[PDB]
Amino acid sequence: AEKLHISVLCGGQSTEHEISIQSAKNIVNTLDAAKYLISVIFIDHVGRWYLIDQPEMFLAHSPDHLVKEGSARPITIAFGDAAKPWQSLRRYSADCVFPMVHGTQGEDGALQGLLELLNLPYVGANVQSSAVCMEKDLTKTVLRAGGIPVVDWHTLSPRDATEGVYQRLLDRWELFVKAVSLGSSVATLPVKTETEFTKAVKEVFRYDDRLMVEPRIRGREIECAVLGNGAPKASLPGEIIPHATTTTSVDLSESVTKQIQQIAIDAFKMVHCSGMARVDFFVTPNNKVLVNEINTIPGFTNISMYPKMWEASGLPCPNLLDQLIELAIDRHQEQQKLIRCYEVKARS
Amino acid sequence: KLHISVLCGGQSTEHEISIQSAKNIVNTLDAAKYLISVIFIDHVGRWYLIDQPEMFLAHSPDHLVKEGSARPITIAFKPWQSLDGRRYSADCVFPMVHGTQGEDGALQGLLELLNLPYVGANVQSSAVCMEKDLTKTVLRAGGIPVVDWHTLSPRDATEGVYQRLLDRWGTSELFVKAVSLGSSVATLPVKTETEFTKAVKEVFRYDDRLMVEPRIRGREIECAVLGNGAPKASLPGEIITTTTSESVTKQIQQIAIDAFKMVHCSGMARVDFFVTPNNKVLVNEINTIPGFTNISMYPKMWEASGLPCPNLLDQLIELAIDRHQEQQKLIRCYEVK
């Protein structure tokens, strides 16, 4: 083969389905055509998989259209077939997979888990890191245990009493009642009263089986794109302003910029991330830098902060994508070596 | 009857124990309640379906593969599909792959993608329990007592580390363990600086992260936890040979339950402890797919606690289906909103 086969996964049974498609389109449009034969795997709303092997068609049409036209081919997977994991319902090659499903299934380790079972190289966080970063309270647990400054939180599960919690949190710290693992605004509720609190708790437990309460923090929402495996690099910080308006130009001191970058890298490492993460911070008026979230499959559309921050840092998106693919393949190669050496040792 | 698919084998060093766990499960599942299929994953990651449980009980899966009774399958995104075009039902999956790919969230991830009910810890909880330093990180953060540890990664300098751990733990005898691997070859006792440095090197050939722990003197005690939101603990068992103080017993059971909840486990886990001579109770590991063979501690501890294996299995399946039902409700409600 003269080119590497790249499969971009998008859609999925996730409320970020449409953003996923837009991310995938940018990636497909931006992948160096000289280096890659690009296939797009579309997962529809009921979880059916389709393969589109003409990237140009994916850029030109909605995947739903391609399904209906018949050009997007129903596929399943071929276990054990390391080279050609996709099988028409004819097998198709994949040298590396770019999981670009946001939220449920895509960032929560599920898709990563399938890809591990297929022994395929894939971009970004592995199963464990995806799961840790997906559950925001678990992320903070790991970060704080390692000494990384985070926005404080309080986890509640359905069996916990809700009475007294509001007051105790007010005493400790307006609050947010948030699903631990859901991003949609439907699952993040601002509360100003006890009554609002318990109503919000009830509401969020209709969506997620665990929630977290957070203090509403005054400060700027600063983001930083991290890239790498073992030796992560951090972009220039960007800012988002909920109405959201975004910009890669924020006027932070040399000190704060440096902190954001270093903590982003340290956080990335602390949750054992791979490939990429967008680390989202609050920076308080007193310039305290606080991690709020690590996103392992950040938006990747042409206006999305992750690629925009890198571009603003001197890394054009095509090069970014090449690096993500290289990192993915390198991780896979290293993991395969460890596995095999252990296998030999263990049975001997 | 409900269709139960028991998944075993796997690309894992615990492949053979997995087969034995599965055989016990298939042997013990109530025939009146279940139509049992076995999914066998071979060493190279190929998947096979055996729809005659008695064949699986009578023969090794490798034999069935060679004979052809273990049919190559893939998934249909009736989750299993032959490679006749036939599709096979599954109402609940019993993943029984130990260690790599079985307890580390990957298999759970696939089952999640397929919207199948399945027994045991979910992706997140599997991943947290699989990597032992992460488990301890989460447990200690929540105030659960655990054996001390120090994680090392390949890029960390080793110089002076041994001495520092000696100073922290007041013992010269340590273990250098892979964070995510169970074989004895990935757990190395060290008692000198030289042994430490050699062990670190050795383990880094097998895992990308390792953990150092002090050698703890005391009894190896285990405890089976069962349930979802309302876990119950078995009477403690001990590893000396295995076997199934009222205060210490209570600490064990309670800490096992609290540990189970703290890692957001579901269905089952075996919580492994040390109990020092001074009666200090320390969690060392949580196993989300513990051995399930006819002599394995998890089912034996339950049997000893008044819960026979067939009934244990029924509850595991009921817990899985119930979890699945609640999870679907949540995601449907969220999707609507």
From Swiss-Prot, chain B:
<feature type="binding site">
    <location>
        <position position="285"/>
    </location>
    <ligand>
        <name>Mg(2+) 1</name>
    </ligand>
</feature>
<feature type="binding site">
    <location>
        <position position="285"/>
    </location>
    <ligand>
        <name>Mg(2+) 2</name>
    </ligand>
</feature>
<feature type="binding site">
    <location>
        <position position="287"/>
    </location>
    <ligand>
        <name>Mg(2+) 2</name>
    </ligand>
</feature>
<keyword id="KW-0464">Manganese</keyword>
<keyword id="KW-0460">Magnesium</keyword>
<dbReference type="InterPro" id="IPR011127">
    <property type="entry name" value="Dala_Dala_lig_N"/>
</dbReference>
<dbReference type="GO" id="GO:0009252">
    <property type="term" value="P:peptidoglycan biosynthetic process"/>
</dbReference>
<keyword id="KW-0963">Cytoplasm</keyword>
<dbReference type="InterPro" id="IPR016185">
    <property type="entry name" value="PreATP-grasp_dom_sf"/>
</dbReference>
<keyword id="KW-0479">Metal-binding</keyword>
<dbReference type="GO" id="GO:0008360">
    <property type="term" value="P:regulation of cell shape"/>
</dbReference>
<dbReference type="GO" id="GO:0046872">
    <property type="term" value="F:metal ion binding"/>
</dbReference>
<keyword id="KW-0547">Nucleotide-binding</keyword>
<protein>
    <recommendedName>
        <fullName>D-alanine--D-alanine ligase</fullName>
        <ecNumber>6.3.2.4</ecNumber>
    </recommendedName>
</protein>
<dbReference type="Pfam" id="PF07478">
    <property type="entry name" value="Dala_Dala_lig_C"/>
</dbReference>
<feature type="binding site">
    <location>
        <begin position="167"/>
        <end position="222"/>
    </location>
    <ligand>
        <name>ATP</name>
    </ligand>
</feature>
<feature type="binding site">
    <location>
        <position position="272"/>
    </location>
    <ligand>
        <name>Mg(2+) 1</name>
    </ligand>
</feature>
<comment type="function">
    <text>Cell wall formation.</text>
</comment>
<keyword id="KW-0573">Peptidoglycan synthesis</keyword>
<keyword id="KW-0436">Ligase</keyword>
<keyword id="KW-0961">Cell wall biogenesis/degradation</keyword>
<dbReference type="GO" id="GO:0071555">
    <property type="term" value="P:cell wall organization"/>
</dbReference>
<dbReference type="Pfam" id="PF01820">
    <property type="entry name" value="Dala_Dala_lig_N"/>
</dbReference>
<dbReference type="GO" id="GO:0008716">
    <property type="term" value="F:D-alanine-D-alanine ligase activity"/>
</dbReference>
<dbReference type="InterPro" id="IPR013815">
    <property type="entry name" value="ATP_grasp_subdomain_1"/>
</dbReference>
<dbReference type="GO" id="GO:0005524">
    <property type="term" value="F:ATP binding"/>
</dbReference>
<feature type="domain" description="ATP-grasp">
    <location>
        <begin position="136"/>
        <end position="318"/>
    </location>
</feature>
<keyword id="KW-0133">Cell shape</keyword>
<dbReference type="GO" id="GO:0005829">
    <property type="term" value="C:cytosol"/>
</dbReference>
<comment type="similarity">
    <text>Belongs to the D-alanine--D-alanine ligase family.</text>
</comment>
<dbReference type="InterPro" id="IPR011761">
    <property type="entry name" value="ATP-grasp"/>
</dbReference>
<keyword id="KW-0067">ATP-binding</keyword>
<comment type="pathway">
    <text>Cell wall biogenesis; peptidoglycan biosynthesis.</text>
</comment>
<dbReference type="InterPro" id="IPR011095">
    <property type="entry name" value="Dala_Dala_lig_C"/>
</dbReference>
<dbReference type="InterPro" id="IPR005905">
    <property type="entry name" value="D_ala_D_ala"/>
</dbReference>
<dbReference type="InterPro" id="IPR000291">
    <property type="entry name" value="D-Ala_lig_Van_CS"/>
</dbReference>
